[PDB]
Every structure is written in C-alpha cells, then in structure tokens.
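Annotators were shown the component list below and the corresponding predicted structure, then asked to write short factual statements about the assembly.
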Amino acid sequence: HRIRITLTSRNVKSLEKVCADLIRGAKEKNLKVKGPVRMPTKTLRITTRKTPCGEGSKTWDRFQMRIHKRLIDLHSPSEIVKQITSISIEPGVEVEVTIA
Amino acid sequence: GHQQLYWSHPRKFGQGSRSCRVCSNRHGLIRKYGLNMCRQCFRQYAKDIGFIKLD
Amino acid sequence: TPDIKLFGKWSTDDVQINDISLQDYIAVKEKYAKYLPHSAGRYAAKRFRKAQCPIVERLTNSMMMHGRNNGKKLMTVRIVKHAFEIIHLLTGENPLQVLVNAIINSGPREDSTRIGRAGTVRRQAVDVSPLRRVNQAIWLLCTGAREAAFRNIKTIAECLADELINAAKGSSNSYAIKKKDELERVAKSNR
Amino acid sequence: GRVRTKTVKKAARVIIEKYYTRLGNDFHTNKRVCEEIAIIPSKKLRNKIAGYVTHLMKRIQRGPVRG
Amino acid sequence: SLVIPEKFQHILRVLNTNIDGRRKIAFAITAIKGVGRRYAHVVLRKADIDLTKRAGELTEDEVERVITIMQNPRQYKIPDWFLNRQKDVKDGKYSQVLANGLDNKLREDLERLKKIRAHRGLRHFWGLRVRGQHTKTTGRRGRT
Amino acid sequence: KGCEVVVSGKLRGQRAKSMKFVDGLMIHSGDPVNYYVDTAVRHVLLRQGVLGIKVK
Amino acid sequence: KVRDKLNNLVLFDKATYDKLCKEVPNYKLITPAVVSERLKIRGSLARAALQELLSKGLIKLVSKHRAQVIYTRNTKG
Amino acid sequence: GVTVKDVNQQEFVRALAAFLKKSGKLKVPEWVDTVKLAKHKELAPYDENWFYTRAASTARHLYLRGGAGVGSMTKIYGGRQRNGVMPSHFSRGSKSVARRVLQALEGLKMVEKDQDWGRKLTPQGQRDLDRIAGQVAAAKK
Amino acid sequence: GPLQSVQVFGRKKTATAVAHCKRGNGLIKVNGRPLEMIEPRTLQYKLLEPVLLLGKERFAGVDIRVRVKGGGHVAQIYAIRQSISKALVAYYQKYVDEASKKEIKDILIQYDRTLLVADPRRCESKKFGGPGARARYQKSYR
Amino acid sequence: MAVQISKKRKFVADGIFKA
RNA sequence: ACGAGACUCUGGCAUGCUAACUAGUUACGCGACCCCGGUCGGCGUAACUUCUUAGAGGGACAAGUGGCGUUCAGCCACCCGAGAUUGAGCAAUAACAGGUCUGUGAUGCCCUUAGAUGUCCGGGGCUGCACGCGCGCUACACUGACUGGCUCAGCGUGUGCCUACCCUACGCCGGCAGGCGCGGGUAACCCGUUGAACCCCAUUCGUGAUGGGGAUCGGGGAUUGCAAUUAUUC
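Structure shown to annotators:
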C-alpha cells in the first residue's frame, strides 16, 4: 500500500526528533521507506502599529510564525502504520496519516 | 411593528457586521487568517498564540 | 584571439595623454580596455578605487541624471556609441583621442573655496586634486551636452559629439571651457 | 574597531594559565583545544578566545606577561 | 512628389473655422470642435484616403466626402457607441453633433437643468464644482 | 537568581507614584531575556483606583 | 535676447530642393536634425529627403537606429 | 537544419504576416477598421493590416509555448495603463481580438485544440513555421 | 565508452544560469537559441566576451547548452557569461591537465574577476518610516 | 471532513483556543 | 551588577554529508517538423542531487606578512580567500502633569437613567468654501509621446465561527467595461514556467501651449449593494 504520513508543527527541534524516531523505527523494522522530504516553510506575517492611540513616532511591530511540514512514505499494511505512529508522540507535533 | 423594525436594517456587510472576539470594538479589525481581533488585543495576546518578533 | 581589445570598432592603443599629472587617472591603455563601457561595478566601495574605472564608463555613469534618466545605462551606452561614431565621422580622428583631449583641456587647475561665517562672501584660491580635475571635466561636459540638448531638434548624441569637439580645441564656444575659464578667473581674482 | 572585551581576555588568560603545555601557535589547533577543554555556548566567542590565545602564545614566546 | 504641388491651399474654411494645411490630415481636423483624435481616424478609414498625406493638398471631392461623412456618421457603418451624443433627451436618436451645435446643445442642457432646478443645475448656475469633489482647498482661482 | 517587584498606582495620596525593589541579578536585553526571566502583569481593584503589579 | 520665431516649412519649394541637391551631398556629417536646422525645414521632410537621396545612391548609410540615423558623403575620387 | 529559434523573431513575424497575407484565407472580421486593441491604448494601429501580424505573433507564441488559451493570450499583449493623474498600472488586452485571431487560426488548418484547455499547433502548421523560418534564414544569409 | 560531462551554474542577483559541457563539435546555445539571438543586442560583446578572450580553438572540442531562469536581463547576461567560463574551467580542470586550466584561469582573472567569482550584492530590506531601504519621508516642522 | 480548513487557519484557531 | 558587548533572525558559500512523483537534472525509447544533425514547458520509465527545497555541521578570528605605537591595548595596507565594517530584533537608572477614559466585562469620582447622554429605525451631516498651511500623485517634453514586435522576477494571498463575502484556467457572446455554462485548488499539487512594468528593436511626430500635460464639463453602457442624487467603481 501507498501510505503517506504528514507531520506539521511549529517547533523545529521536536519535529526533527520525532522524525528521527519514526525513521529509526522504519529502519529497525526493515521495510522500504522514503526519506524525510522537506517542504518549503511558510511564514505568517502580521504588521501592526505599536501605540493604541495616534500619538508618537510611527513605529511598527513585525510578528512571524514559522510552520514546518514533513512527509514520509511507507510500504506496509495499516496496522503497522498505526502501531508505529502511536509510540512516543510529542505534544507540539501533529501527525496525520492517509492512504492514496 | 416593533418586532419587525427592531433589526430591519441589513447587516450582511460593512464594518458594523464585524466585531472583535475579545472586546467587541468595530475599529482596526485583523481579518487576516481569521484572528478577528483589534490591533491592541492582538498585541496583548500575540505571544501565547505563537507570533513572535524576529525580523 | 584577442590581439588588442577593440572598443566596439575603435583601437585602444596609440593614444596620448599629454598632461603628465593625469597619467594614472585615465585608464584607457593596455590594462583597462574593454569591448563595452558596461561593467559589474564595485568601484565606489573603497576610497580611491574609482580612479581605475575607464573614462568612457565614467562618462556613461555620469551621463544619466535629472530624475527621468536614472538607472537607464543602456540608453547612455548607445548615445555614447553614436556620439563616438559621429566624432570619428566628422573629424576623421579616433574618438578616444578626442575624449581624452576634452578631459585635459576642460579640467580646472585652481579653485576658490568659500571662507568666513554663514552669510558673508569671501573666497580663497587653492589648487585642485588630479582626481577632482577629471570629475569636474566629466561633470561639466555631461551637463553642457545635457543643457545643449533641451527643447531643441538637435539630438543629444550629436550634442555630446559637438561638446567634445569644441572642448578639445579650447575654442570657448562650449559650456565646459567657459565654466572652467570662469572658475579660473574667479580663483585668479583673489589669490 | 576590533577590541576584545573583558570576558574574552579573562577566558583566554585562564586558558593560558591553566592549560599551557597542550597549546601552540596554530589557530586551528588551539581552537580545537579550547573547544574541548572548556564550554563555550557560541562559536564567535570560541574563535575570538582562540585568536587571543594565539596572540598570547606569541607574546609568551618573547617574554613574561604580568597577568 | 516631395516638391509642393500647385494651388496648395494654406487655410481651410471647413464649418466656418480656420483649418491649417500644414498639419496632418488625421490631426488637422481635430481642431474642429466636436471631432477629436479617435474620431478623426474612423472618418478617414471608411473613406479611402491614406492618413500619410497632408491637409492642404487634398482635393475637394474627398474633402466633401469626409465632410458628409462627419455630418452623417451612422449611414457609413459607424457603430452607435462611437458617438458623443447617444440617446438625446429631446428627440431620442443617436446623432454626432458638431461645434456650434455642441455649444447650443450644452447651453440648452444647462438651461433645462436650471429650469427644472436640480442640484446639478443649481451648482452650474452658482459656478462651483458640480461633479462632487472637495472644494475646501482646490479651486482657488474661481474668484478674487 | 534575583528578582524585582514594581507596584505602580495612587500609593497613599492623590498623585500616583511607583516603588521599585531591585536586588540581585536581572538581565534586560537580548535573546536570553526570553527564557531566563518570567514576566507577569496583574491589576488590583481597590476602593480608590487600580494598582498594577510587575514581577520578574 | 532675440526671439526669431521659427516657421519650418512642410513641403519643398523650387529653390530649397536644388540647394539641398547641391549642398547636402557635400556635407561631412549628415543628420536629419542638422539639415533641418541648416535649411529651416521640418523634421519629417528632412527624413523623407534623405531617404530619397539614399534611394538615389548619392548618400552613404553608416548606422540606422530608431532614435537617429547617421549619413556621410561619398568620396570625390 | 533550421528552426524558428536560431533566427531573429522581429523580421520573422513580418515575413509570416506577409505569408498569411499572400495566402488570403484568414477570414478578416468586419470591425477591424473601428477597434481598439486594448483598453489602455489611445489610438488605432497605424497599419490597416495588423491582423496578419497579430495572427503571426499568436502562431509563434503557440509554437514556443502550447496550451495557451484566450486569457493567456490576453496576458501576453498587456501593457502599461497610464491613468493620467492616477499612478499607472498593468492592464490586460482585449479578449475578442484574441478569440477572433484564434478562431481564424482554427478555421485555417494550422491550429488545433490542446487537451483539456488552450490551443496548440497542427503538424502542418509546424511545417509552415519551419519553411518560413528557412526562407527567412536564406534571405538573411 | 565513458561519457564526459560537467554542469556548472552561475548567479549575479537572483538569476541562475546552468551550463552543460560535453563532447562534440563547437556550438554554444542558451535557452535553445545561439548567443547572437539574445536580447538586448547591445550586450552581445558581454555575451561573446569569454569566447573572444579564449579563442574558438578551446571551444572546438566542446558544445555548450545553458538553461537560465530568474532575475532580470542584465543579471541573466552576466550569469550566462560567468557560467560559460566556469563550465569550461571545470571541464578542462576535470579531464584535461590543470596546467592548461592555469593559463585559462590566470588570464580570466587578469581580465575581470566576475567571470569566475560571483558578486555578493543583494537588495536591502525596506524599513518603516521611509519609502525605501535608507531614505525617509519628508519631515515637517511647526 | 468536508470543511477541513487550511494549515494556517488550523494553527490560528488552536492559538485562539489556547488564549 | 545593569547598559554596550555577548545573544536571536536574515543575506552572502560548500560539485562534501542527509533525502525528495506536491521540486528537478542527465541518459534511453516513442512522437512531430526541417536540411546526415538540430528544436520540442510533447509522451513515458534507468541513475543522480548539478538547479530548487531544508536539517545537522563547516567557515572569519585582526588568522599570516610589512610598517606606526611604552613595541601593551590597538591602527593602516597587502596575499590567499564567496565574505577582512550585511541589514535588523532586543535594549539600563531617573523622570515628563507627553498621548490614550473613543481598544476593553481595566477603573476611582462626578453626571444622566424612561419626554434618556442607554438602545433602535428613517433621513441628513462628517465632503459643505472669500482664504492659509502639511504629507503626497501627475506634468512642464524629442535621454520624449503614440503605434506594433520581442523578452525577464521575487515577497505574498486564496473557499472564512455565530459570518452571507475566495483566487481563477478553459469555451461562447460583445469594441471595451462585462454576462452565461463548465472544471481546479483547503494548497511546492490549481491559478502559475505568476509570459509584470521600466528597458530593447522599428514607424509616425518635429520645438508649435504641439500627437506634451489631462484639470473642468456633457451624453451613453455595465458591476457591487436594500438604497449611489452631494456624480460608489469602471
């Protein structure tokens, strides 16, 4: 089966740690696994005035929100995919599994 | 006819049809990404949402 | 097979810089000879790096001014090319020799600076740098050609051509020679 | 200007004082030495400390230093 | 050819106004009020006169041809949206109007607006900006 | 490692004032102010007005 | 401070045509702007006359551009 | 061996326009005399036979990139819209001119319909472009 | 047998021109068309400058196919003229003895540095309170 | 789910919910 | 001890490392055209990361050389080198009768509280015009205007909570503004290889308040919306 697992999160270190854990499980289970494909990141920019009133020098704030997304493919039945995704998950990392 | 003339004016559009979800003020709304706040409440609540200053 | 670097169609050798004080501020002979006056740049980074720039590239750089011409380098390149063609077709001489002679004869050699408080008029004559002589020559020739080609049927490619022809002889019918002699007379009036 | 601050100078001075035999005049060698014998959080601070260690080695090779 | 021909008329009296012959024929009739730069190209395209010729050297046959074309636009395959007066308020037909007729039509239109006493007619009678723009700062040379 | 407490308001009088109690070590600038100090702002509703609390 | 209001003629008369035919091929530098300045003619007329003499073979073309064209005389020998 | 790419496109478009004019099988529309090619233009085109040049440029653009439809043709021939006092912007061209050019090229056996969108070239049309390019290269050599 | 091929890129601002040097007769084409048919024509000497500097005998054993994408016009021309020189230098340096690479590289550096070294000049970010990177809005007093 | 809003709006709604 | 520095983000490079059918390159086969080879963002599958994407690491430190300096802190220039001063973020004590009660279910005091200063509906005003000032847009032209052709990007955004309102390829009709059927995209997948402008080439114009400039003003036709007159926008 063509099984695709999508991981999208905000932090980068916990995302890399859980991706390393998943690829380590795929390597120790001895099955064909695609590499960690790194999609381009998206930034959410909101620019707003600092002062609440209309007095002062025209100073502005710059907010950002980096979003990192990975996807790793597998060749296995579904129960292996669920039992390998439901092990040692991180709170700040979303996991999302579909089959084509 | 007060039951029909209480809210007979349409509010399908305009800036009076929008409101902040914190203080309900119809000025300086942030309609990007569906925050739907004013700018002051956004600066108050920006850190715990995930928006940080790096640039 | 680059025997010599033809500047479009003009030879870069057999040209003479008569003024000995400008031997290392006119980069035309045997080292800084390119096919085109367009380069990448990086000459205005250091303190004396602009002296190694070729004089035709500096002329094309100082040619574009007055708001509506900023950044348009290619148009200045083709106007300078047509001007060089007109100069060669008119005088029967190499266009680089006319341009080099126009630099030397249009460069002022003594300038009066303003001294005193803010409001009074008082001058004191000093001599000028060889680099500033070249800069004033290029600026004077460029603004003379620009003022000559304004609200007139005469195009700027032959207005710049007649600018360098009159400056190379010192005939005082050009703007640059007249302003040079004005600066020399004001400097000489109160030495 | 390139003037080292007091943290770089104190760290390099105690590195010269405390580990002296396993050093040298090469910037990369004592750079790796200062990498392993201490804990520097950044890398620019590590390179500045290693450069001042190299300069202090060149100064010790000519004579004594009153620090 | 390039030599000036015989009886080259210097001026023209088309619709009682002086029209010079030095200008281009696609642009000399622009000086006729009511006909502009875009309208002059269509009139000279339906009629078979090349637009590279001058104004004072054309002959009377093609002059009267383009003159009858200008007073009769619609009967020469000119579309109805090319007209400066479409669906007139009095007679209700598409008719391109010329100079003195244009002044007369504008004068009676302003007279009609003043007679019906609309806001546009009142502002035209007072002599102020009528299209609805800010008059706090701009429009200083209206009076002294 | 160190702390400071700022209390601002109409402290015993009509005109407001502020008292600052700084001792110990407190950094102010750079990236390490994000994950070394902890900032909390609170408001006190008394009978005369509003008193603010700044603790770090 | 003389004004000297310009009146550049549009079509060639009898005399300007043959003064052009006797003077323009004897010019070192030939440009529509300079021949319009010298003969007090309009610019399009100058371009048409120089195109006509270019077709007649009495004018040697050098460079052609959308901004200007440059022409020169032929050799006497 | 000569294609359309190793030769100047400026004279190539003119020669292709002359070839389609000499063919005389293009079905020129009725409102060609009274039309503005874009809303950002001011006057009519100077030449009375601009339709042949527009069809030649459309065929060349279809050769360089196939699958271009009406809206892709409208984006190519856009320009700068000078709004006078207002700052200028970019505006697309006229759609009916593009549709009539593409329908003329469909009525001629030169342009067929690309799959699921746009228009492309018939191999007879690619032959015609290659022969015109060979003629242009032979004339320029 | 073995196939000889190198693939070297080149940048000025954002344009990337990637060449391809393999064995064959001498022909240079960028984006499917030769060097003579590249606009603007007023930089044709900048395009043909390394070919005129090194001669056609060095290019006779290779053919060059450059793909270019991004940037403007002038930056694309400079990227192509850098990438052709870098690809020829890398092909000579890989398969021919590198002494010949040294008499190519010394005269290439001696003419102009940008034939082999990229220009590290990028656009500065815009700041608030002004129309551009460094300019500010006009200040009014009173 | 038929609605399934975008990845930006998901993190936005999650942040609004936590706030 | 704080401030500076140190720190964080981004840019500039590594043909070395880790992996890419939601990104490509190179070979091979099929297919189209031309005169034995060239072109194809036409079709498909044998390796790879040279382009792209993004993770760990590396690299620059005044390190080397020559002068000046107590020969200390340091300065100048040069060689090799993608860089020998990239741009920002954060930013101390003490205060200002600085601005905000019109951001707040943050608030003390005072006023009003049923013929209301709360609230709701309908109409109007916030634009009004002898004048003055500030930030700005377009121009005064021929390094230019018009008319065709050729050709080149990067940040973004995109079907919504009570909330109804997204970005658009393709085909037809109409000069154009626009209208109707059909499909795609909850997004490196579709708009989109974002065929952007300034530039480049070639005609027309010819120093004329002129084909510069488009203010003012008249008529007609579409779209949004419950409603446009004080002209919404085109």
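Statements collected:
1. Chains F and C do not touch (no CB pair under 8 Å).
2. The longest strand of chain F covers residues 2-9.
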